[PDB]
Design a binder for these strands. Structure first.
Ligand SMILES: [K+]
Ligand SMILES: [K+]
Ligand SMILES: [K+]
Ligand SMILES: [K+]
Ligand SMILES: [K+]
Ligand SMILES: [Mg+2]
Ligand SMILES: [Mg+2]
Ligand SMILES: [Mg+2]
Ligand SMILES: [Mg+2]
Ligand SMILES: [Mg+2]
Ligand SMILES: [Mg+2]
Ligand SMILES: [Mg+2]
Ligand SMILES: [Mg+2]
Ligand SMILES: [Mg+2]
Ligand SMILES: [Mg+2]
Ligand SMILES: [Mg+2]
Ligand SMILES: [Mg+2]
Ligand SMILES: [Mg+2]
Ligand SMILES: [Mg+2]
Ligand SMILES: [Mg+2]
Ligand SMILES: [Mg+2]
Ligand SMILES: [Mg+2]
Ligand SMILES: [Mg+2]
Ligand SMILES: [Mg+2]
Ligand SMILES: [Mg+2]
Ligand SMILES: [Mg+2]
Ligand SMILES: [Mg+2]
Ligand SMILES: [Mg+2]
Ligand SMILES: [Mg+2]
Ligand SMILES: [Mg+2]
Ligand SMILES: [Mg+2]
Ligand SMILES: [Mg+2]
Ligand SMILES: [Mg+2]
Ligand SMILES: [Mg+2]
Ligand SMILES: [Mg+2]
Ligand SMILES: [Mg+2]
Ligand SMILES: [Mg+2]
Ligand SMILES: [Mg+2]
Ligand SMILES: [Mg+2]
Ligand SMILES: [Mg+2]
Ligand SMILES: [Mg+2]
Ligand SMILES: [Mg+2]
Ligand SMILES: [Mg+2]
Ligand SMILES: [Mg+2]
Ligand SMILES: [Mg+2]
Ligand SMILES: [Mg+2]
Ligand SMILES: [Mg+2]
Ligand SMILES: [Mg+2]
Ligand SMILES: [Mg+2]
Ligand SMILES: [Mg+2]
Lengths: 118, 97, 205, 244, 233, 152, 124
RNA sequence: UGGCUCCACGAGGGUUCAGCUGUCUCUUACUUUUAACCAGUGAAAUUGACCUGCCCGUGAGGCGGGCAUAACACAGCAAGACGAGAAGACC
RNA sequence: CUGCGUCAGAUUAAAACACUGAACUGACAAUUAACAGCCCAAUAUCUACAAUCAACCAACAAGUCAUUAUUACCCUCACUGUCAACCCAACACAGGCAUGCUCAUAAGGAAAGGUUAAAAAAAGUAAAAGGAACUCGGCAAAUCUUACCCCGCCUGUUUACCAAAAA
RNA sequence: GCUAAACCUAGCCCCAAACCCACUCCACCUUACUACCAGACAACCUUAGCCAAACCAUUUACCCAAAUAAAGUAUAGGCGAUAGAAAUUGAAACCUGGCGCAAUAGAUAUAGUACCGCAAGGGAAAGAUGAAAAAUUAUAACCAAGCAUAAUAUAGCAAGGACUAACCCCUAUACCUUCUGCAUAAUGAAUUAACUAGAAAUAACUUUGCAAGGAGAGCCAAAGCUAAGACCCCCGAAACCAGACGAGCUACCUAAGAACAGCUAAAAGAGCACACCCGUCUAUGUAGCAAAAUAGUGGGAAGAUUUAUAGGUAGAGGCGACAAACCUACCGAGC
């Protein structure tokens, strides 16, 4: 391609323009109502027991009349607690491994370069 | 095959670093300090292995009794299985009776 | 975007080039070279600066650095610490011999005082205005960052506007008048589009 | 590795944080209390020490409660603490015979009760123990207001208690609107259970119900920044004018 | 893939130490072999040519501008010493020191054909002193560097002895010395502070005598013919 | 617009308008023989033929008559060193027919004459290499491998 | 036997699956009796392209431009630049009350507007 | 409640008249495939090591007494290598 | 789910072969809706009489195709499938695979790498005279034969992969 | 001299301390990752069993919130295998570590990826230059098994005594394990490299310390007490129980479809006979084309027929014109 950087420049410029417009819209929304988000949402537990940010959709009938919305479950039964604990323990194992590896790397680096100690 | 063709790099051991120079200090803290401190109070390690000694079954039982509630699910299950296996082995197997 | 393996080793060829791709295939797993960590504030070697080589084939010589690699603490001195390699080599030609430099370390070279050609030790100190500069321990003075050509190779001093380049005055003029309207309704009013029908309220959940 | 805290402390830790931490202190204490319920299916010894007949020595004895299974159908009635007993039995009461699973169930009756405080009639499923407890307490209202939750063992009973406490706190005129004399008579007959309204409003609420109620209380739409900005601007202008 | 161009849009560029060839070709006059015997007339003609060539004097002035402490009267001896040291480096194949005496363009001509051979080269005698035939300099800031070329004439006695891989004699004779006349060019990167004069190329006059024949016989195969193609003279 | 929430519409509702569009299209050379008045585009997957018609009529003032769209499936047969399939993206191809009988052809975006250097270019490395190539000559067969550097 | 590691698209499955699965395009109508598609004109997005004649701006900015420091726009800055002068002028005049915020620019409700701010009913 | 028979039907279990034929007396000729040689590609079961003979005896290529005996490649053969062969059956 | 379309390839392994070598690698291109999928406002109220050329006649197993009264309703052609030498069997497997036409093709393919004609082995053809003498048995092959005994009324079902039977 | 061999990092293990992550825009419970229509649809209920008791049937330890001691005591128990308290007493605690592993080790991990299975699920292997590869003229020598350089000459567990001399001469019944005893024709081994299998201190013995006392609360003591040293393996069943996953094959059923030429006959669970379904006999094949096929010959082929699609019955079970058949290529009880 003759000038590939032109495409990158155009993409960056369009991203900047969209950023400016969205910033103006966000400032106006904060001034008029104060909502930090343009789309309604909520914090709910799914069937798997993890907190999720559910983004609301738009319908024509209220939620209690809706069939598909009512079929979806937003509560977790007690059998997911053990799996949540297992996930937490797995994350703890990964974090501990990362920390120990970082400490080992620091010790090896100090051994190899004495003037880091000095 | 099975043996290295090059000499390993030489290993330098500082016989006079801080730990080697100060190793053994305060081992007689009780004798020389009016018995305010016990030498086993200088033990740094697991909570269940401070000032105590025993075989593998005893160590497993002590660990389960001390920190059993804080262990992860998999580790606790493995500890229970190990205790059962060691119990069976020690109480039901051996040359001597 | 960027596809670099965790232990990708940086070399003379820039990452993503044909030579770099051939040297470091995606599947290669070599021993990671241990590099002394230098903070961004602590690093003080910059392109276009004259530095003297302390150790090597030709020590005590001063040369201007042409390339720097912060990943390996490498500084490449132009025309110094060079070996010779054949280029333009084919099955019928014996090749053209050209010199190519080798990497140097920040400990291997020492920055030199421009007014007194002798290597010195330099620390970062602030000016009266707060601007950060580097001052040497011995015979303290200010050695600013040498001017270096831009990465994109653009020269504002010799820049001529093209048919699709916005003029400076038009790009600088301010037209935004702050108000409490959105771009959509502002443009609708500007273009004269009329919408009388209202939006019936819907259910969000 | 090891957790910082034991697993059984995690419920208290999560009560210490989040929306649970903003619940009323009295409600939190009431939930935290773990007093032992009254024995029903086992007979307490009554003494801390007893003489062992075989060796004639004073040995300490304890009352070990017997586990009770409360089916979900018991939350719509007043069983009075009785429940299903799930256990094992030796055939013919002989240790050398087989061990068989056994389930003991209480006998249930659908009686009609009238509440003087609530001025309403309820048809609930109760037991002979519940009827005896009501007779001992001298009235359904007295029984509900006296027996704690660990003896009521009924969400419906806790709801009745909350309603009665709320009415007593509010001195609600809806109880016999045209007979203030009778309303005052009932209120002074049950005056001994007077509870402040802000504390009676949370009586009998489960953890989920309390969390939902607190979320409803905290549910306020955000105030637009325009109001706060104009308020701070006008305050600054007033202070500047005073300085002038 | 081609290695001609390193990746583009790169600040770093390949640094060069020497030019591709002589900036201005020098044509040796016919009969310089006779002028060699006419030693006095050789000196007179060299002086006259240097005086008459204004470009030579301007180039020398530029060289003095870039390095004032430079002399023309002493350079022939230094050039002879550099020549002899460079040719002696071939005997022990010390390319590390040869890099400091010859140019990167001269190096292939001195190493590629003697990669796998043993050369016993020695300098025995000098018939006529060297003389600076012509001095010329590179264009001003052609790529940011300035080079200078100095032409010298050598008429000296040398010895050549080249052996094959197995040590069998392949070319030359190690005892008898023979006369050699050649024009030697020297190049130096004036702009580079650490640059120095190094032997760069040599000039082969069209009237040069044919070189010494080789020991063995060589067969040159004719044009191989495909079945459809017949032989054509 | 793509990756956005379209507001729900009800009877008597306002006309739906888009002021800034993220739809980007590419005019492409057809790989097979096509009629004169047919132009080929690669368009985003969330774009319909009605949207393409309005897009071309509004932004580019191009009168269109008929639009026909299809979806091309990207090859998934590529496998890397880990033997994991690499997916080429699926893309939507649209064919647009001009309205008033105009004829469109795809011109040559890379003319050979324009590729040829009309101006002068002097690359130092290229000059050095070509000079060395022209100066260096193959060894004379009658020399038989004897180095040509020695003047003796 | 089935490939469960590939994206589930409309090209996979029987006729019902292929005809029912979409590809992301928005709907612009509804199907009535007889499988007849009725298209609603006001559900088709309208590209509001302005008039570009006599436009000074160009896609690329000349490099001969000063580098103004980046200052993100905030609600406080917008309020100070827009409503602060009118509010301070009205305060200096002396006839001010919180019941005139509608005249000052404040919108008590979004209902009855073509462009609601929360939730917004207009596209990008 | 118990016992017999009747027509039709059957890749069901036996038998019969005639014809038929290489089933046989007693096999032969031809064609294809296979096969053997040349060229390309190229497995598996198995395998303690073997420099791996016969007769007689003893408890058999390996022990004892005799006999035999330059080395080696290809195509058949199935007497032996309790041919792992080939697994099953019986207490 | 792109899997013998185009270009290029140090290529070179598809049970051999390859220079255009290629059913391998990299890049580019493609299958355009009329066929098909994706349908339908509400509340009440209708719907005994098969099909079989449906006329004969003859039935039993008794069958595969229907609305009206009223209210509401006038915007219309969007989205998706469309390629191939292809699926299930670890394989470019002599196997398994629904429907409409072609009933032998107008469409689709190649049993033999080259040679010689040893043994043994597989298939086929021909055979003097005899015609079951072979064999547990007319097993196979040839011809188009009759009658009987035992068992089960008969059609049908069963041990996918050693028993199709008298069960 | 070919195949090869070596090459140290990636990271991992055990602790201490400290309480951890989860909205860029859009989509994601319908056939998940699918912009957009009237519903009622909801969780709570003792673990069992293997194993020990040399069978087995009552019974058989399983963190329940303070280290030590009381104490293996009181108690329980086919009073037996075994189980087993409490009152009472009370204890310190400074993460920045290792007489841990170094690519068959250490996590399975380069990755829960490739691949296998309908599904639950199972689950890998590997890398190695150099300061500089913008030095490829480079990461030289030698080293397991297997070959080549370089086939073989009577005779024999292949060796030993020897010899001038390789053989020729004399002597010599392979190894481990199991049985009293084997060369036995009883089991195992083609070869090479790496990995792979004896864990505990009651009593006694040896050497120290102190001594009628020993021991850093508790215990022992009529020379004892305290401390140390030193003894107790690996692999392999048919099985049992709990909780998930399977009726895309097959057994049966439900919904709505499809196919059956020609002839004789008669309104046939009729006959001959294609498509089609099945598989009596023979031959080939037996690591095959095929974990059940091919050629011929056969029964049925308008019916209790064959068959495409969707759905249902799930293992203490289903289904079955009972073959102990079939339930995803080993069903007297699936995975
Ligand atoms: K039959
Ligand atoms: K034989
Ligand atoms: K056997
Ligand atoms: K069967
Ligand atoms: K592994
Ligand atoms: Mg039959
Ligand atoms: Mg053959
Ligand atoms: Mg062959
Ligand atoms: Mg093998
Ligand atoms: Mg022999
Ligand atoms: Mg005998
Ligand atoms: Mg014998
Ligand atoms: Mg013998
Ligand atoms: Mg043979
Ligand atoms: Mg279409
Ligand atoms: Mg249609
Ligand atoms: Mg095959
Ligand atoms: Mg078949
Ligand atoms: Mg052949
Ligand atoms: Mg005959
Ligand atoms: Mg006979
Ligand atoms: Mg006969
Ligand atoms: Mg006979
Ligand atoms: Mg007979
Ligand atoms: Mg027959
Ligand atoms: Mg029958
Ligand atoms: Mg009959
Ligand atoms: Mg069978
Ligand atoms: Mg059969
Ligand atoms: Mg819809
Ligand atoms: Mg709808
Ligand atoms: Mg037992
Ligand atoms: Mg038994
Ligand atoms: Mg206690
Ligand atoms: Mg590993
Ligand atoms: Mg070897
Ligand atoms: Mg012998
Ligand atoms: Mg058992
Ligand atoms: Mg079970
Ligand atoms: Mg089903
Ligand atoms: Mg089925
Ligand atoms: Mg018919
Ligand atoms: Mg029939
Ligand atoms: Mg059947
Ligand atoms: Mg039979
Ligand atoms: Mg038939
Ligand atoms: Mg059946
Ligand atoms: Mg039976
Ligand atoms: Mg039976
Ligand atoms: Mg099975």
């Amino acid at each position: 391609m003759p000038s590939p950087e032109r495409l990158d420049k155009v993409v960056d410029s369009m991203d900047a323009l969209d950023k400016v417009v969205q910033e103006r819209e966000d400032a106006l929304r904060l001034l008029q109502t104060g909502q930090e988000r343009a789309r309604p949402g909520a914090w709910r537990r799914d069937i798997f027991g993890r907190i999720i940010w559910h983004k609301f959709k738009q319908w024509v009938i209220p939620w209690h009349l809706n069939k598909r919305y009512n079929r979806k479950r937003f509560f977790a039964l007690p059998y997911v607690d053990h799996f949540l604990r297992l996930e937490r323990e797995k994350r703890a194992r990964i974090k501990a491994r990362k920390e120990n590896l970082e400490r080992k790397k620091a010790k090896i680096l100090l051994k190899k370069f004495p003037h880091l100690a000095e | 095959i099975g043996i290295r063709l090059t000499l390993p790099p030489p290993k330098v051991v500082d016989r006079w670093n801080e730990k080697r120079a100060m190793f053994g200090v305060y081992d007689n803290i009780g004798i020389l300090g009016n018995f305010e401190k016990h030498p086993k109070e200088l033990i740094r390690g697991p909570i269940w292995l401070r000032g105590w000694k025993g075989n593998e079954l005893q160590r497993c039982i002590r660990k389960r009794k001390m920190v059993g509630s804080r262990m992860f699910a998999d580790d606790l299950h493995n500890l229970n299985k190990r205790i059962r296996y060691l119990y069976k082995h020690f109480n039901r197997h051996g040359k001597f009776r | 975007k960027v596809t670099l393996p965790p232990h990708y080793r940086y070399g003379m060829s820039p990452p993503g080039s044909v030579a770099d791709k051939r040297k470091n295939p995606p599947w290669i797993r070599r021993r990671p070279v241990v590099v002394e960590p230098i903070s961004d504030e602590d690093w003080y070697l910059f392109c276009g600066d004259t530095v003297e080589i302390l150790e090597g084939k030709d020590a005590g010589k001063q040369g201007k650095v042409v390339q720097v690699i912060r990943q390996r603490n490498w500084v490449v001195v132009g025309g110094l610490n060079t070996h010779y390699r054949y280029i333009g080599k084919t099955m019928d030609y014996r090749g053209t011999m050209i010199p190519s430099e080798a990497p140097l370390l920040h400990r291997q070279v020492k920055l030199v005082d421009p007014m007194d050609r002798k290597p010195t030790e330099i620390e970062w100190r602030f000016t009266e205005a707060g601007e950060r500069v580097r001052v040497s321990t011995r015979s303290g003075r200010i050695i600013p960052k040498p001017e270096f050509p831009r990465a994109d190779g653009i020269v504002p001093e010799t820049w001529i506007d093209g048919p699709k380049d916005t003029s400076v005055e038009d790009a600088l003029e301010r037209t935004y008048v702050p108000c409490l309207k959105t771009l959509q309704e502002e443009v609708m009013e500007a273009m004269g589009i009329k919408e009388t029908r209202k939006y019936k309220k819907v259910y969000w959940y | 590795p090891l957790h910082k805290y034991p697993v059984w402390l995690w419920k208290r830790l999560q009560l210490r944080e989040g929306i649970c931490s903003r619940l009323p202190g009295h409600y939190l204490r009431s939930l935290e209390e773990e007093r032992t319920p009254t024995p029903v299916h086992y007979r307490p010894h009554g003494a801390k020490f007893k003489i062992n007949p075989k060796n004639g020595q004073r040995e300490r004895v304890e009352d070990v409660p017997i586990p009770i299974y409360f089916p979900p159908e018991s939350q719509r009635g007043l069983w009075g603490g009785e429940g299903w007993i799930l256990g094992q039995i030796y055939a013919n009461n002989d240790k050398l015979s087989k061990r068989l699973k056994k389930v003991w169930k209480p006998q249930l009756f659908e009686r009609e009760f009238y509440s003087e405080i609530l001025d309403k009639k309820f048809t609930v499923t109760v037991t002979m123990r519940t009827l005896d407890l009501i007779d001992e307490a001298y009235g359904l209202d007295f029984y509900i207001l006296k027996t704690p939750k660990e003896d009521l063992c009924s969400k419906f009973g806790m709801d009745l208690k909350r309603g009665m406490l709320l009415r007593l706190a509010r001195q609600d005129p809806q109880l016999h609107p045209e007979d203030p004399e009778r309303r005052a008579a009932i209120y002074d007959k049950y005056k001994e259970f007077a509870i402040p309204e802000e504390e009676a409003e949370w009586v009998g609420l489960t953890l989920e119900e309390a969390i939902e109620k607190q979320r409803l209380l905290e549910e306020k739409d955000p105030v637009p920044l325009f109001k706060i900005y104009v308020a701070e601007l006008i305050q600054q202008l007033q202070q500047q004018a005073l300085s002038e | 893939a081609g290695l001609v161009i390193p990746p583009e849009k790169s600040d770093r560029s390949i640094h060069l130490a020497c030019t591709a060839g002589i900036f201005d070709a020098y044509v040796p006059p016919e009969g310089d072999a006779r002028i060699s015997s006419l030693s006095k007339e050789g000196l007179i003609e060299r002086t006259e040519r240097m005086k008459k060539t204004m470009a030579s004097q301007v180039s020398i002035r530029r060289i003095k501008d870039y390095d004032a402490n430079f002399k023309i009267k002493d350079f022939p001896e230094k050039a002879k010493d550099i020549f002899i040291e460079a040719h002696l480096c071939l005997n022990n194949s010390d390319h590390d020191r040869l890099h400091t005496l010859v140019t990167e363009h001269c190096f292939p001509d001195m190493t590629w054909d003697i990669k796998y051979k043993t050369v016993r080269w020695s300098f025995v005698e000098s018939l006529e002193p060297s003389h600076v035939v012509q001095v010329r300099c590179s264009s001003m800031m052609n790529q940011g560097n300035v080079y200078g070329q100095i032409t010298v004439r050598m008429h000296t006695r040398q010895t050549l002895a080249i052996y094959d891989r197995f040590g069998r004699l392949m070319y030359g004779q190690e005892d008898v010395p023979k006369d050699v006349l050649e024009y030697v060019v020297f190049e130096k990167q004036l702009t580079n502070p650490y640059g120095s004069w190094r032997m760069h190329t040599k000039i082969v006059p069209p009237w040069a005598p044919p070189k010494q024949p080789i020991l063995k016989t060589v067969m040159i195969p004719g044009p191989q013919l495909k079945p459809e193609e017949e032989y054509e003279e | 617009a793509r990756n956005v929430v379209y507001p729900l519409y009800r009877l008597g509702g306002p006309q739906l308008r888009v002021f800034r569009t993220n739809f980007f299209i590419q005019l492409v050379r057809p790989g097979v023989a096509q009629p004169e008045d047919t132009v080929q585009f690669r368009i985003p997957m969330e774009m319909t033929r009605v949207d393409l018609r309005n897009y071309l009529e509004g932004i580019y003032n191009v009168p269109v008559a008929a639009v026909r769209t299809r979806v091309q499936h990207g090859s998934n047969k590529r496998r890397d060193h880990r033997n994991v399939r690499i997916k080429k993206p699926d893309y939507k191809v649209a064919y647009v027919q001009l309205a008033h009988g105009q004829t469109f052809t795809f011109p040559d975006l890379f003319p050979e004459k324009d590729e040829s250097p009309e101006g002068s270019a002097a690359d130092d490395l290229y000059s050095m290499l070509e000079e060395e190539r022209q100066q260096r000559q193959s060894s004379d067969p009658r020399r038989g491998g004897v180095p040509s550097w020695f003047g003796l | 036997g089935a490939d469960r590691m590939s994206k589930w698209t409309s090209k996979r499955g029987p006729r019902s699956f292929r005809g029912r699965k979409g590809r992301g395009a928005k709907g612009i109508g509804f199907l009535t009796s007889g499988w007849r598609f009725v298209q609603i004109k006001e559900m088709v997005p309208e590209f509001v392209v302005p008039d570009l004649t006599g436009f000074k701006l160009k896609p690329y900015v000349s490099y001969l431009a000063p580098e103004s420091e980046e200052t993100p726009l905030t609600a406080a800055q917008l309020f100070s630049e827009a409503v602060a002068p009118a509010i301070e002028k009205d305060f200096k005049d002396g006839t001010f009350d919180p019941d005139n915020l509608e005249k000052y620019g404040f919108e008590p409700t979004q209902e009855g507007k073509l462009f609601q701010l929360y939730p917004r009913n207009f596209l990008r």
